């Protein structure tokens, strides 16, 4: 890991929050060396992200330097497109609508630069309809630079220069998974395909595309720019770079947080700036990620850093980078039960494992929060969570076992005392 | 609730404005022709923008625009959440309840809205326009239990905002589309400054 | 004509035998010596199906509503 840091400085990959959020002249960071970057060929950028080996901030590994170079057929006769996500579907993420808040010029910096690696034709970015004021300024941020003759259709100095076509969903599902977005980009109902047909860079819209995240392509200008010998900065030799965080739950200041790989959460969450709940001698029961990570008590996770294998050394790792706690006042069972209630109101409905398996649980998880009659249903409720893994298509089958499967772990007198109270009350 | 039509208005009618037909030209120009074939996500939502809630006669209209079968449109409008088929109000309010918003003291930004307003919970107002729903997953749980409106959002909620936003909109004011208190820029507060400078020598791209 | 029971003569009327093959099918109608008529076994097209061909660029097989 090195020196247990993961500091915070001003030499970052973000421009700045409070400096200027509107249109501008791209002062120092943006459009610094514009045409000289894409003057070279694709192999100058293909494998260039291996200096970081950026894993990808969508919610999994499979490094974004590898998916652009490898698993990328050259050409047969048909065009190619780019699909950049912007939907934030994990609850309490806030990693988006902060990049679009103050730094919108950076996203078109590497849109044309990232598409040169694939050689795609057009760029389709996808914003949630609910974020309407920020997405209104995004199309204004097009006309500030793109209309000014800097980009498209041959600008600048290259035969490769293209557009960015903004769409919106309404209330959709396609955040948490690809292959439902390239279906909902068409007009169909967004009930997703199988994920390996012929996976997403074989069968797409009409012709093969790519799926990336916001800071999977927002860091791509400066990672191709600063590069190094800096791209391995913090953490071990597994993960490398600096990733965006957020602090939510119980804090004096729940605020946006920026750091690098493998910081211990005991000194990271208490910093920036107040840890207003019980820092110790209360519970401070923590969740590693957004929704694909179950509970941890006050045990070794506070000594464990934020490496990918550090949480995989524990029961569950996470890539959403969202921190939520509940020390004293909150009921433990009550909070996560409304996160299983969440999945009933987003899930697709195709596969009989996910549909009519979540509702098997949501009917009975609301019984455990009440406190009711005889236990040993817990192991049955544990088995059903053990029975949705490879059965569903998308990750929301796998993202619905995990808050159950870890609540059943780690916590013996959760409802053994609660159901005792109602068994005593009925007595 | 149900999702069926017991023949309220088969022919409402609902035709578009000639200002709106030329905006349909721009959308079809984006998509590649042939597999264009469905621009139904902005086209049907543009019909929501003119009306406010779209009846069944609006669904039959866009099929004749895009030469699709009609059942291809009845389907899609009943999946996504934002579209409205029942009648709605002038101000459609959303109280974003989730797990961290439950932890962020939604409890007072819960009821005591109805003690402030006087309606049933989760229900439209009996008169005209206040219609109350609750939604999930929009951005910041790093803020308070924020309240979105049809054009913006209200960060940093509190019962004083319940005493304000409900109150000021009954007279028709604009109750602060943003964080009403706290940090105006959503900063680390103890890490906010970080020595604002040019970003430490741009030009490592020699390589 | 007292109830409606479909009464009958024709004392065979309920006999199915199960033979293993055609080669030993006709070898029983001759040994007891009655006439016959032989059908044929029908097995379907092999055939060509491929999920993932339901999404096209210029072809005609492209499904929706799923």
């Amino acid at each position: 890991f090195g020196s247990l840091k993961d500091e915070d400085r001003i030499f970052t990959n973000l421009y700045g929050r409070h400096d200027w959020r509107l249109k501008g002249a791209q002062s120092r960071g943006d459009w610094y060396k514009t045409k000289e970057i894409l003057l070279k060929g694709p192999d100058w950028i293909l494998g260039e992200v291996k200096t970081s080996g950026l894993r990808g901030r969508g919610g999994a590994g499979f490094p974004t330097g590898l998916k652009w170079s490898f698993m990328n057929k050259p050409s047969d006769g048909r065009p190619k497109y780019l699909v950049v996500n912007a939907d934030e579907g994990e609850p309490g993420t806030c990693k988006d609508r902060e990049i679009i808040r103050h730094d919108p010029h950076k996203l078109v910096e590497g849109c044309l630069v990232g598409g040169r690696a694939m050689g795609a034709r057009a760029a389709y970015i996808y914003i949630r309809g609910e974020f309407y004021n920020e997405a209104s300024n995004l199309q204004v941020a097009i006309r500030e630079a793109y209309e000014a003759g800097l980009i498209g259709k041959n600008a600048c100095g290259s035969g490769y220069d293209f557009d960015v076509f903004v769409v919106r969903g309404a209330g959709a599902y396609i955040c948490g998974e690809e292959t439902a977005l390239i279906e909902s980009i068409e007009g169909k109902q967004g009930k997703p395909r199988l994920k390996p047909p012929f996976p997403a860079d074989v069968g797409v819209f009409g012709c093969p595309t790519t799926v990336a995240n916001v800071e999977t392509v927002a860091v791509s200008p400066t990672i191709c720019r600063r590069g190094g010998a800096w791209f391995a900065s913090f953490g071990r030799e597994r993960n490398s770079g600096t990733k965006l965080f957020n602090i939510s739950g119980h804090v004096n200041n729940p605020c946006t947080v920026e750091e690098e790989m493998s910081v211990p959460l005991k000194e990271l969450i208490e910093k920036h700036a107040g840890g207003v709940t019980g820092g110790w001698d209360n519970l401070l029961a923590v969740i590693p990620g957004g929704s694909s990570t179950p509970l941890i008590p006050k045990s070794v996770c506070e000594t464990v850093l934020m490496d990918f294998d550090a949480l995989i050394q524990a029961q569950t790792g996470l890539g959403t980078a969202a921190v939520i706690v509940m020390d004293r006042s909150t009921d433990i069972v009550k909070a996560i039960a409304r996160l299983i209630e969440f999945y009933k109101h987003e899930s697709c409905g195709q596969c009989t494992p996910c549909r009519e398996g979540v509702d098997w649980m949501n009917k009975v998880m609301a019984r455990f929060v009440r406190g009711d009659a005889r236990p040993a249903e817990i192991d049955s409720l544990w088995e059903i969570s053990k029975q949705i893994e490879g059965h569903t298509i998308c990750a929301l089958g796998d993202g619905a076992a995990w808050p159950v499967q870890g609540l059943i772990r780690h916590f013996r007198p959760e409802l053994e005392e609660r159901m005792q109270q109602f068994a005593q009350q009925h007595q | 609730v149900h999702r069926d039509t017991p023949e309220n208005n088969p022919e409402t009618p609902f035709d578009f404005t000639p200002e709106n037909y030329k905006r349909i030209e721009a959308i079809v120009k984006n998509y590649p022709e042939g597999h264009k074939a469905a621009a139904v996500l902005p086209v049907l939502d543009l019909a929501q923008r003119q009306n406010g809630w779209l009846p069944i006669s609006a669904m039959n209209k866009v099929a004749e625009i895009l030469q699709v079968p009609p059942m291809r449109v009845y389907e899609v409008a009943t999946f996504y959440t934002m579209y409205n088929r029942k009648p709605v109000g002038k101000y459609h309010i959303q109280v974003c309840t989730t797990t961290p918003c439950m932890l962020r003291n939604s409890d007072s930004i819960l009821e005591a809205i109805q003690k402030k307003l006087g309606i049933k919970v989760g229900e439209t107002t009996p008169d005209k326009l206040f219609t109350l729903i609750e939604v999930e997953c929009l951005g910041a749980c790093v803020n308070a239990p924020m309240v979105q409106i049809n054009d913006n959002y209200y960060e940093d909620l509190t019962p004083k905002d319940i005493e304000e936003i409900i109150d000021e909109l009954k007279a028709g004011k604009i109750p602060k589309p943003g964080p009403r208190s706290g940090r105006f820029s959503c900063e680390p507060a103890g890490g906010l400054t970080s020595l604002t400078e040019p970003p430490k020598g741009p030009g490592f791209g020699v390589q | 004509p007292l109830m409606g029971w479909a009464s009958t003569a024709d004392p065979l009327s309920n006999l199915v035998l199960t033979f293993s093959t055609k080669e030993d099918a006709v070898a029983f109608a001759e040994k007891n010596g009655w006439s016959y008529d032989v059908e044929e076994r029908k097995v379907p097209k092999p055939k060509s199906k491929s999920y993932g061909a339901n999404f096209s660029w210029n072809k005609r097989t492209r499904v929706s509503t799923k």
Partner: peptide, 28 residues
């Protein structure tokens, strides 16, 4: 911060330059 006024976004300057489109065919 305005519920309407999408023609400023949609067809104001993005109608002059699309660009181009060529977009292929796909008749089908």
């Amino acid at each position: 911060y305005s519920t309407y006024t999408f023609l400023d976004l949609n067809l104001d300057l993005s109608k002059f330059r699309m660009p181009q489109p060529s977009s292929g065919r796909e008749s089908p």
